[PDB]
């Protein structure tokens, strides 16, 4: 009956959500290593988008294309929030290293511009328009 069928479904899929998060952990780790490699070398200058940010955004795009049909929408949103958190951590580290501060000066302006390219790229991907990226965190 419908009840027994669904009990079988429940048993078969009981770990589905937890296991997707575990595979997604490996994907976050891959992107985290890319961000560390790229952002450790980032220099603030025109033109924008900088080569660093073009590369980050291209890989984010390719990642989205690769997993779109493999993850439910909510998990894809959650994945991108984790990827974003990694990006912000590495960007914050580099801005601190370079002594770039949020004072409205030309250097701050260039980072704001590069980040606008990043945010625009991310939010233009299917399902990601209303992600709360909290990019202001990078100046903490
Ligand atoms: Mg300046």
Curated annotation (Swiss-Prot):
Disulfide bonds: none annotated. It is found in: Golgi apparatus, trans-Golgi network; Membrane. Component of the Golgi-associated retrograde protein (GARP) complex, also called VFT (VPS fifty-three) complex, composed of VPS51, VPS52, VPS53 and VPS54. EIPR1 interacts with GARP complex and mediates its recruitment to the trans-Golgi network. Interacts with VPS51 in an EIPR1-independent manner. Acts as a component of the GARP complex that is involved in retrograde transport from early and late endosomes to the trans-Golgi network (TGN). The GARP complex is required for the maintenance of the cycling of mannose 6-phosphate receptors between the TGN and endosomes, this cycling is necessary for proper lysosomal sorting of acid hydrolases such as CTSD. Within the GARP complex, required to tether the complex to the TGN. Not involved in endocytic recycling. Belongs to the VPS54 family. It is linked to Defects in Vps54 are the cause of wobbler phenotype (wr). Wr is autosomal recessive and is a spontaneous mutation discovered almost 50 years ago. It causes spinal muscular atrophy and defective spermiogenesis. This is Vacuolar protein sorting-associated protein 54. The gene is Vps54. The chain holds residues 836 to 974 of 977 of the full protein.
